[PDB]
Symmetry: C2
Subunit: 337 residues, 2 copies
Amino acid sequence: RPWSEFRLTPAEAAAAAALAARCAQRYDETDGPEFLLDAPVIAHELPRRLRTFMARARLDAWPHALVVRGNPVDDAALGSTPVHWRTARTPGSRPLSFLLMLYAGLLGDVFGWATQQDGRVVTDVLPIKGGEHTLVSSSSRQELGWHTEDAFSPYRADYVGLLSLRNPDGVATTLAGVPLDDLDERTLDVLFQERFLIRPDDSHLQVNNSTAQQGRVEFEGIAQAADRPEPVAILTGHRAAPHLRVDGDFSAPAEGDEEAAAALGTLRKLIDASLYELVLDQGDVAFIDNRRAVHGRRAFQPRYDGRDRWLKRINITRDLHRSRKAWAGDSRVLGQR
Amino acid sequence: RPWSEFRLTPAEAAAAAALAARCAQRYDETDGPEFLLDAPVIAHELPRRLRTFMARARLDAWPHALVVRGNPVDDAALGSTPVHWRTARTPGSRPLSFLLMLYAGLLGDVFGWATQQDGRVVTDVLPIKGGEHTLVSSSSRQELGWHTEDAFSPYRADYVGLLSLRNPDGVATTLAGVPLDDLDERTLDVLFQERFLIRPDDSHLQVNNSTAQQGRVEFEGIAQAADRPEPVAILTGHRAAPHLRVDGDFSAPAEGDEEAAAALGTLRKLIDASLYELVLDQGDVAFIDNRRAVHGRRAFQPRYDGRDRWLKRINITRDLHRSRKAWAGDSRVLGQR
Ligand SMILES: NC(=[NH2+])NCCC[C@H](N)C(=O)O
Ligand SMILES: NC(=[NH2+])NCCC[C@H](N)C(=O)O
């Protein structure tokens, strides 16, 4: 497999669940300052075999993601899938949100965006009725196109954590790495040059946040990035193992740069051709390497019967201080004027 | 204080020492692949109050370093200070080398350089007879000028760990942050521009490595960086809290750029004026923030009687994958053709 996989024993899974439940009892919320600070140390109490996996697999050169299988989820206890992310912090999902944050603490510094889902650190992925054909993660009938998470931003995550609360019909997450086996050197050269525009995706629009937030000064920075994007490279670092920054629906070549356009067009076709599926079954967690891979989600027919697919999500950086310019009165919720 | 300080209780210090001693019994060496991989997980067994300090203090916005006081060191057990770093992996210093690596594992990914002290991850700082007036860390009579560690390299450490094995005469480490209170905005503007040359320091020369290593292809990259340095910025990131990349003895303005030169000259004087002292007494460990501060060491008269000042040192990055281009057949020992 192109990802690294770990399966918890039932005993390990129960121990991790018990730890998350204890945290849920002792702390008021996941995104509170106290649990944000404490979670990385509390995570040291997770099962040792899991801690070893996370410490080693993060340092491997190859995987597109780290996948942890086997966290129990009781649908009766969980309750119905929320109709919107706003109302998605349900008591039934609370322990699992704490669990995701504990796992994330083993990989780095968690953070959110002032301009996405009301500045929440733990976010939700679920289908919103009426929003089936949008470019945001609450779509369904329209495939969520492949992307580097928050591609527009230099402060985008190193890892994106996804915990599947439920996924009864096995809807696939999509993944692709750099198509290095098919990129000729001239095309590769051009992708390494600062000749591309990457604009913020629609999740950072005021319309996709609550009316109270509309509001925040950080939406100004989003507008600046959308209106006047700075040319950047799609590939960076080592030519034999490049890091990737692209969004199929929000990337463009620099104004009138047809050579850059050709390179982006070639990249699109090669990523489309190599895209593969990872199904996060109920209880599965994935930490996608946001530098090695783009990801998306297959089109699916939403149910709207209370049992729709539902993920908790979290952004993770290896170094919070990289984003200090965007510390919006809060180091864990990023944005700029 | 401009650094964050933690003092171990005797019980905590003894527990940490016992853990390091256990590691020293079970592993062949600190730089072996096994302990490199295991140390970050074994470090989860360190005293909880220390783990909390390291997890929180790393995320604070202000400190120039994280300092841990109170590790016991028995001079009789330690033995005499080595005459050279080559011979400095003495049995008496072995547990303390493991201790340094355990502490470092709480902050990030440790690594070394193919071209410095024979590619060792745990390195040594001690005075070498005949080398009193050099620009390397084995100097004594000549002050070690302030510097960002490995300033020339984009893969330089985020944190530099220093453990004082002995320092009987209390020789000071020097530190300085960005002199933001005195830099005018025009000068600040220029320091943020890619108008400066930073060459590799003398520790990366073949003459300062063993004759067997002279040898390695990675010295080619050092020569390239010395002969044809690429213009880079001294300050990066947030203008209200910039990150710093400079070396007093190995920095220069870009060819004929007198405005850049003026900015560097002003910076020199302001750093010289704000330089302060941190004395690492026997058993003290410091993790210097290599982005917020430059550091050095005061001139001292060497003893050469077997009780000279002696530190173990280690480079730490928040993300090993940042340096994958420089993974020299080994992700933990960096260098390039
Ligand atoms: N090509 C795209 N649709 N990009 C945007 C991805 C989805 C966005 N990050 C969200 O959570 O809604
Ligand atoms: N300005 C300087 N002397 N810079 C070089 C610093 C010392 C070097 N990192 C060493 O270990 O020897």
